[PDB]
Design a protein around this ligand. Sequence first.
Ligand code: MG
Ligand code: MG
Ligand code: MG
Ligand code: MG
Ligand code: MG
Ligand code: MG
Ligand code: MG
Ligand code: MG
Ligand code: MG
Ligand code: MG
Ligand code: MG
Ligand code: MG
Ligand code: MG
Ligand code: MG
Ligand code: MG
Ligand code: MG
Ligand code: MG
Ligand code: MG
Ligand code: MG
Ligand code: MG
Ligand code: MG
Ligand code: MG
Ligand code: MG
Ligand code: MG
Ligand code: MG
Ligand code: MG
Ligand code: MG
Ligand code: MG
Ligand code: MG
Ligand code: MG
Ligand code: MG
Ligand code: MG
Ligand code: MG
Ligand code: MG
Ligand code: MG
Ligand code: MG
Ligand code: MG
Ligand code: MG
Ligand code: MG
Ligand code: MG
Ligand code: MG
Ligand code: MG
Ligand code: MG
Ligand code: MG
Ligand code: MG
Ligand code: MG
Ligand code: MG
Ligand code: MG
Ligand code: MG
Ligand code: MG
Ligand code: MG
Ligand code: MG
Ligand code: MG
Ligand code: MG
Ligand code: MG
Ligand code: MG
Ligand code: MG
Ligand code: MG
Ligand code: MG
Ligand code: MG
Ligand code: MG
Ligand code: MG
Ligand code: MG
Ligand code: MG
Ligand code: MG
Ligand code: MG
Ligand code: MG
Ligand code: MG
Ligand code: MG
Ligand code: MG
Ligand code: MG
Ligand code: MG
Ligand code: MG
Ligand code: MG
Ligand code: MG
Ligand code: MG
Ligand code: MG
Ligand code: MG
Ligand code: MG
Ligand code: MG
Ligand code: MG
Ligand code: MG
Ligand code: MG
Ligand code: MG
Ligand code: MG
Ligand code: ZN
Lengths: 138, 99, 83, 124, 208, 99
Amino acid sequence: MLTDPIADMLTRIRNATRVYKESTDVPASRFKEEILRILAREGFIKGYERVDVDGKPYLRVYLKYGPRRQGPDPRPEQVIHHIRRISKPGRRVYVGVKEIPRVRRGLGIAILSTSKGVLTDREARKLGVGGELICEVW
Amino acid sequence: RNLSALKRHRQSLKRRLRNKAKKSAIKTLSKKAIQLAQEGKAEEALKIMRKAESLIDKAAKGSTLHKNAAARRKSRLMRKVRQLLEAAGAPLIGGGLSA
Amino acid sequence: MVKIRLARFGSKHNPHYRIVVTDARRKRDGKYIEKIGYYDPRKTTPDWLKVDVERARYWLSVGAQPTDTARRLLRQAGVFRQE
Amino acid sequence: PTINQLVRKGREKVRKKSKVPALKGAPFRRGVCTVVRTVTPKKPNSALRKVAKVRLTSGYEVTAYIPGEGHNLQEHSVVLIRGGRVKDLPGVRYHIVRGVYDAAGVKDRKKSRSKYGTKKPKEA
Amino acid sequence: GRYIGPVCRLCRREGVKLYLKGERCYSPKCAMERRPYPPGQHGQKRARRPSDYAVRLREKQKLRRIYGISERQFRNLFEEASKKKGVTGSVFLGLLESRLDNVVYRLGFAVSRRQARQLVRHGHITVNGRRVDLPSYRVRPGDEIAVAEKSRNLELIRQNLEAMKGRKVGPWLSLDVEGMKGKFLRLPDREDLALPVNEQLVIEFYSR
Amino acid sequence: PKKVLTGVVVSDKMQKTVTVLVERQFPHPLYGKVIKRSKKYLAHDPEEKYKLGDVVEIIESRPISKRKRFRVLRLVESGRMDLVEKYLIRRQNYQSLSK
RNA sequence: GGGAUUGAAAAUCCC
RNA sequence: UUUUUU
RNA sequence: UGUGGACCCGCCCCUUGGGGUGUGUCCAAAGGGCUUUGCCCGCUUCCGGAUGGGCCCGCGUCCCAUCAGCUAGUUGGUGGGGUAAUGGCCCACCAAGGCGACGACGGGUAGCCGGUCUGAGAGGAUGGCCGGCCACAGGGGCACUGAGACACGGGCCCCACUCCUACGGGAGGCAGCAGUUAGGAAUCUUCCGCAAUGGGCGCAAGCCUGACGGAGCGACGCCGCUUGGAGGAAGAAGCCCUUCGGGGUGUAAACUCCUGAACCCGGGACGAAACCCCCGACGAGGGGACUGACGGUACCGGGGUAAUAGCGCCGGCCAACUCCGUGCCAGCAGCCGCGGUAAUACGGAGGGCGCGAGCGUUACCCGGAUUCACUGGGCGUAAAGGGCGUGUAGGCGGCCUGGGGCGUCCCAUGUGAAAGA
Ligand SMILES: [Mg+2]
Ligand SMILES: [Mg+2]
Ligand SMILES: [Mg+2]
Ligand SMILES: [Mg+2]
Ligand SMILES: [Mg+2]
Ligand SMILES: [Mg+2]
Ligand SMILES: [Mg+2]
Ligand SMILES: [Mg+2]
Ligand SMILES: [Mg+2]
Ligand SMILES: [Mg+2]
Ligand SMILES: [Mg+2]
Ligand SMILES: [Mg+2]
Ligand SMILES: [Mg+2]
Ligand SMILES: [Mg+2]
Ligand SMILES: [Mg+2]
Ligand SMILES: [Mg+2]
Ligand SMILES: [Mg+2]
Ligand SMILES: [Mg+2]
Ligand SMILES: [Mg+2]
Ligand SMILES: [Mg+2]
Ligand SMILES: [Mg+2]
Ligand SMILES: [Mg+2]
Ligand SMILES: [Mg+2]
Ligand SMILES: [Mg+2]
Ligand SMILES: [Mg+2]
Ligand SMILES: [Mg+2]
Ligand SMILES: [Mg+2]
Ligand SMILES: [Mg+2]
Ligand SMILES: [Mg+2]
Ligand SMILES: [Mg+2]
Ligand SMILES: [Mg+2]
Ligand SMILES: [Mg+2]
Ligand SMILES: [Mg+2]
Ligand SMILES: [Mg+2]
Ligand SMILES: [Mg+2]
Ligand SMILES: [Mg+2]
Ligand SMILES: [Mg+2]
Ligand SMILES: [Mg+2]
Ligand SMILES: [Mg+2]
Ligand SMILES: [Mg+2]
Ligand SMILES: [Mg+2]
Ligand SMILES: [Mg+2]
Ligand SMILES: [Mg+2]
Ligand SMILES: [Mg+2]
Ligand SMILES: [Mg+2]
Ligand SMILES: [Mg+2]
Ligand SMILES: [Mg+2]
Ligand SMILES: [Mg+2]
Ligand SMILES: [Mg+2]
Ligand SMILES: [Mg+2]
Ligand SMILES: [Mg+2]
Ligand SMILES: [Mg+2]
Ligand SMILES: [Mg+2]
Ligand SMILES: [Mg+2]
Ligand SMILES: [Mg+2]
Ligand SMILES: [Mg+2]
Ligand SMILES: [Mg+2]
Ligand SMILES: [Mg+2]
Ligand SMILES: [Mg+2]
Ligand SMILES: [Mg+2]
Ligand SMILES: [Mg+2]
Ligand SMILES: [Mg+2]
Ligand SMILES: [Mg+2]
Ligand SMILES: [Mg+2]
Ligand SMILES: [Mg+2]
Ligand SMILES: [Mg+2]
Ligand SMILES: [Mg+2]
Ligand SMILES: [Mg+2]
Ligand SMILES: [Mg+2]
Ligand SMILES: [Mg+2]
Ligand SMILES: [Mg+2]
Ligand SMILES: [Mg+2]
Ligand SMILES: [Mg+2]
Ligand SMILES: [Mg+2]
Ligand SMILES: [Mg+2]
Ligand SMILES: [Mg+2]
Ligand SMILES: [Mg+2]
Ligand SMILES: [Mg+2]
Ligand SMILES: [Mg+2]
Ligand SMILES: [Mg+2]
Ligand SMILES: [Mg+2]
Ligand SMILES: [Mg+2]
Ligand SMILES: [Mg+2]
Ligand SMILES: [Mg+2]
Ligand SMILES: [Mg+2]
Ligand SMILES: [Zn+2]
């Protein structure tokens, strides 16, 4: 069985971008969907859309990358330089609203899951709530 | 040497004999009362019970039983003589107890 | 018996007292019920005595007993003035 | 180790062993001498190093090093132990305080006088 | 007891003129004139490229010796600046500048730091009407630093103030020259100090 | 507030008394995962009402005996013996791991 | 305890 | 055979 | 005598033994003083308050698993004893229970905390002084008196020790303040005082208080402060080096002028205002009087002398270099290493660096150490994958929906003593 679907999705994306794949499919789950909504909304991916692979529902994540570069290693700079699962099973991480970090001195995001929905660290701070620290993206 | 706080000890042994005496009466009367409650004499048992009670509260007056200890002994005594009087009841005097 | 007295909080040769409600049986610099004032005897500052009268009057309605000096300083701050 | 593992077992603090059983963990310890010897050093060097077997107030008989150019330390003389190993002599884990009870300071010692326990002289 | 001994030797060991001697650090006798190399037998030898530690050491000494202070008060003042709100670098300088002896020197009452220290020590200095004999007394802004009228008739004070006529004073200071008054208007800024010292190097000497 | 816990009765074999097993969830103070600890209380059952496998509330109470400071508030869930089976099995493993 | 010997020392040889 | 590769 | 309270029983309301009520029974006390017809200090019963406390519970609280099984009042019950009070706290009888790998039982170690130290923090270390709690009073047991003790300067008994002893028998108990001795690397005065604050008794006057306030000793810590400031030679003597030209110590000394630590003289405290007296009613309020250890000390004013410097270091880490002596010697040494004829490492000197009434050393704690890795490590060859499986406990858990709201998150609130920060 898949042990942690979210780490699996984070990683599907990580690997996918490391070889500069146009898209990548991840098994559909509402919570995953709500994550991809934050990635999209924050400009980390081009977007996502629901799809059916051999009858089973998935999410096509369309990733984005920077400009093709100069002399050797023309490979573009990454948009998602770093994706890390934080609160995994068997070691859970919940933060109060004053425990919510500042990711990359501002330039990254910390996806929280709050009782008021899946927020970024900014969204969840200005909403005045904390919750489970899902992952760093930056 | 020779603190006259020793006076205190001299008084201790005085009060020890006061306390010790009244208690000994209490017990010796209490048993007496119960002995007649078990033996079905109602009037005598109640007559003695009233003297027990009086001696109890009188010992509460001073430093022997001062607290609800006296009330403890009263409670247990009245319960025991009523219940022991339940064998062929006939509460003749009916003084100490309530209707 | 609960008492109103002073507790010395200055340093050597520099006393500062804390008018204080405590059980008579505790140490003088020990744990008290309530701090209800301070006393500076060398009068080093403009305000060297503060009381909060209406609290002292509480502790007197329930029978705290002030020291002769505590009562001196309380009276001075007008705890007993009834006009 | 998994989090479950660290929960179940947990880390193990590294107990540090003393390098000097001058007992009571004391800063110094007085003892009487047993012998006053001269030992040959480890491989890279060679000399005659004056050491001493000491019976200690802690209940220990240990070797101590006698610093300085020359000493008066004798068989029965009492001395204070400082601690600190002599590298190039195995077994010697403690030094000897010069300028203590029966151990004279170094005569004519003009440079490092705190160590070696010698007074301050006069200049005419 | 502060450093007491030959001073124009530290002028040399730092490599910069140290005006602790007061006058004669101006007349071409300072020994920084025609002797800029450090003291000792090996002074005229070619010096080796100093270690990174050596640099921050000589900078801290260069400042310390300038104000004429023990290491103890020096470091306690520094840690005070490290705790206080604001730039540690300039806060420290404002604090050293706030020493009563340093103010006295700075007000032109004394030829030198050391002389200012003795003048304070002997109670010749007034602060807001009161005698103060501590060279370490922290001057606050708005404090009037005067000369005790007892000593106003002394020839050393009239001697120095005589040369202070028309001499200009630091933008955070002001003085009346006849009545021998003076006032600490505000704390000096970095730009208010010409100190040939890099503060960052000193801060970086205490990170270790 | 009198403390009140909810647990599962794992012992019937006393008179007027039942053993209640109360789990408890809390994050580890250093390693932070949620750990599950559990404690057994001897709860007072005056009517011999509650049976094995019952899930009962238990209330801080005036001491009944040594080791009895709680009384059985009420019944939450009747007779789920799977809990009792986990406790019994765990007890049973201890017969190994000795010699 | 000195010479030969070795950068020196051991070993070896000489009074 | 022992130290010192200079 | 019965305001009232206590006990049995009944009824009501509450809900664990909380409040009311009825009948019955039981229970109170002390006087003293004067300005002696009225008032002050007391006394009795009851309710309430305030303060101090008992007992109970949840949670947290070091190491060893080379300690794995423990338990006979042991676990529960009924009744009883006891206590202020629940309770195997004890007792009788009944049931056969209770605890343990979530570490029972045993062993080692140890007062706990507020805090303190360190650290970027997380953490580690620690609990001296000060504050709070506990425990103990030569070792062990015990009760008495009392609101309160199972009582440091109270009692009884057993044990060990010191002293008296008419040999029959007695007296003791500084872990109270000083002081002695022992041990130890090491820890103070057989000091002043009731003036302050605080406590006990007293209507008060007042008495006691080694609590306390002060002094004494010890650089043990912290902090402030002095051993001079300004002028003074392209540069004395001595010392050191040298290419023998000179270089250094160095404006440093001399010497010129200025100030004036010590010390002398005089003045000289705050801490002290109540208790008390008088007016007013012994109230509010007003008024008035006595009251010092520190101490003639602090402080002020006058006069006034140039007037202790030390210790470590100079091979790298690490800031500071040359000469001579010594030749695997004498010795240095935190680690790496120096010395076997030119040693910046040994020893001295000149010089220099670092601190400065201190400076070094040893011990111990944290740091660097991401070197027990929660933050924040690893296991092919460096230390580390169990020889393999099956599987118990435990850990962990795919997609949708709904209830709950245990974890999780938010708001309010009580708490988080004072000190410290
Ligand atoms: Mg008496
Ligand atoms: Mg009899
Ligand atoms: Mg009693
Ligand atoms: Mg108390
Ligand atoms: Mg008023
Ligand atoms: Mg182990
Ligand atoms: Mg001798
Ligand atoms: Mg700062
Ligand atoms: Mg300004
Ligand atoms: Mg730092
Ligand atoms: Mg049952
Ligand atoms: Mg029971
Ligand atoms: Mg078993
Ligand atoms: Mg040859
Ligand atoms: Mg060799
Ligand atoms: Mg009545
Ligand atoms: Mg009645
Ligand atoms: Mg009567
Ligand atoms: Mg009478
Ligand atoms: Mg209470
Ligand atoms: Mg019972
Ligand atoms: Mg009692
Ligand atoms: Mg029994
Ligand atoms: Mg458990
Ligand atoms: Mg112990
Ligand atoms: Mg800190
Ligand atoms: Mg760290
Ligand atoms: Mg501890
Ligand atoms: Mg601890
Ligand atoms: Mg102590
Ligand atoms: Mg004992
Ligand atoms: Mg005892
Ligand atoms: Mg009493
Ligand atoms: Mg006793
Ligand atoms: Mg006791
Ligand atoms: Mg005693
Ligand atoms: Mg005899
Ligand atoms: Mg001794
Ligand atoms: Mg003392
Ligand atoms: Mg005297
Ligand atoms: Mg007194
Ligand atoms: Mg008094
Ligand atoms: Mg009285
Ligand atoms: Mg007396
Ligand atoms: Mg004292
Ligand atoms: Mg000394
Ligand atoms: Mg001079
Ligand atoms: Mg003169
Ligand atoms: Mg006074
Ligand atoms: Mg006065
Ligand atoms: Mg009158
Ligand atoms: Mg008055
Ligand atoms: Mg008086
Ligand atoms: Mg006097
Ligand atoms: Mg004077
Ligand atoms: Mg003069
Ligand atoms: Mg001189
Ligand atoms: Mg250093
Ligand atoms: Mg160097
Ligand atoms: Mg040396
Ligand atoms: Mg030679
Ligand atoms: Mg040579
Ligand atoms: Mg050589
Ligand atoms: Mg040398
Ligand atoms: Mg060296
Ligand atoms: Mg040397
Ligand atoms: Mg020298
Ligand atoms: Mg100092
Ligand atoms: Mg020291
Ligand atoms: Mg270490
Ligand atoms: Mg660490
Ligand atoms: Mg290691
Ligand atoms: Mg290690
Ligand atoms: Mg890890
Ligand atoms: Mg590693
Ligand atoms: Mg190998
Ligand atoms: Mg290997
Ligand atoms: Mg294998
Ligand atoms: Mg293997
Ligand atoms: Mg799930
Ligand atoms: Mg589950
Ligand atoms: Mg739901
Ligand atoms: Mg909830
Ligand atoms: Mg709160
Ligand atoms: Mg606080
Ligand atoms: Zn100069």
